[PDB]
Ligand binder design. Structure first.
Ligand SMILES: CCCCCCCCCCCCCC(=O)O[C@@H]1[C@H](O)[C@@H](COP(=O)(O)OP(=O)(O)OC[C@H]2O[C@@H](n3cnc4c(N)ncnc43)[C@H](O)[C@@H]2O)O[C@@H]1O
Ligand SMILES: [Zn+2]
Length: 294
């Protein structure tokens, strides 16, 4: 029916500490990593698209294209040079999902981000669907040779400004990210067909819900699954010209809630209502300290 008392964060917090809320899926995107220094994609100001000028490209959205990459892999590796952050420090929001994992509530984190911050916060591969791949490993692009390289090796080059070539054969080696023109990993489809039968709560954070097929995951849940969006803008509402998106505001709204603000602040507030505020503050502070001693 309508599983939330109210369509607010308080409604979602009460629902979460109830009977019916056992399995939680997170859909996350670049918004949850901006406060760790990793810029946005589509934000007007600091977004990646309004900063692809000095990369001499035929058009902005062309440096994550696979066939252009194998043609000229140098602009992308130059881009990774500029973006590659000094420290890898996951945000409050990342640690919020770690709490969900530790409390037995996280069924899966579906992420569009390539920065590996879900792993450093302590989500394990079983927990994650890296829907656009990852920077954490790299593979030679051949086939005869698909030799896997770690991030430590792929980081020496990029910063030694040397284009990474396989050591066994002499082929290009590419971070395990999914460029445009590539298919999403099989794991994505296998998890989607099973995870969304089960799910009792959808948590969407820091994503504009524009790229597909990732955006459509919100409609894979049963119609009674409450869906909370933490984002600084609303997203996932049907375009009025097309024709199960998000409905926060119509009179037919019954399960979608939009908390508008910083993902870090939305997760602080949700954790506070849940009794986890201190536990969360201690975890972040403990882990940021352990990372600052490296
Ligand atoms: C490890 C080193 C990393 C450096 C290397 C960088 C190379 C990256 C290459 C990526 C290639 C993978 C394929 C790809 O590009 O997919 C991209 C991306 O995965 C996909 C999905 O887009 P996305 O994750 O949804 O990112 P968007 O920019 O579209 O959405 C950001 C949303 O979030 C909001 N927001 C922003 N900040 C906050 C914040 N602090 N708090 C709350 N909300 C925030 C923004 O207002 C906005 O609504 O569109 C893009 O193709
Ligand atoms: Zn090779």
């Amino acid at each position: 029916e309508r599983l939330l008392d109210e369509l607010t964060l308080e409604g979602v917090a009460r629902y979460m500490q109830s009977e019916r809320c056992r399995r939680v899926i997170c859909l996350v995107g670049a918004g949850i990593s901006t406060s760790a220094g990793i810029p946005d994609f589509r934000s007007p100001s600091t977004g990646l698209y309004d900063n692809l000028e000095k990369y001499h490209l035929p058009y902005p959205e062309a440096i994550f294209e696979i066939s252009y990459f194998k043609k000229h892999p140098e602009p992308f590796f130059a881009l990774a040079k500029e973006l590659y952050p000094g420290q890898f420090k996951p945000t409050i929001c990342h640690y919020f999902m770690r709490l969900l994992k530790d409390k037995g509530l996280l069924l899966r984190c579906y992420t569009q981000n390539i920065d590996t911050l879900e792993r450093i916060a302590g989500l394990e591969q079983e927990d994650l669907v890296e829907a656009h791949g990852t920077f954490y490993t790299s593979h030679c692009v051949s086939a005869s040779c698909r030799h896997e390289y770690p991030l430590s090796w792929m980081k020496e080059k990029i910063f030694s400004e040397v284009t990474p070539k396989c050591e066994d054969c002499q082929s290009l080696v590419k971070p395990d990210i999914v460029f445009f023109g590539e298919s999403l990993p099989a794991r994505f489809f296998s998890c989607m067909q099973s995870d969304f039968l089960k799910v009792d709560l959808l948590l969407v954070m820091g994503t504009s819900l524009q790229v597909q097929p990732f955006a459509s995951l919100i409609s894979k849940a049963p119609l009674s699954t409450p869906r909370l969006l933490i984002n600084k803008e609303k997203a996932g509402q049907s375009d009025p010209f097309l024709g199960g998106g998000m409905d926060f505001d119509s009179k037919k709204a019954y399960r979608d809630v939009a908390w508008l603000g910083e993902c870090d602040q939305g997760c602080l507030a949700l954790a506070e209502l849940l009794g986890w505020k201190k536990e969360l503050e201690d975890l972040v502070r403990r882990e940021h300290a352990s990372i600052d001693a490296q």
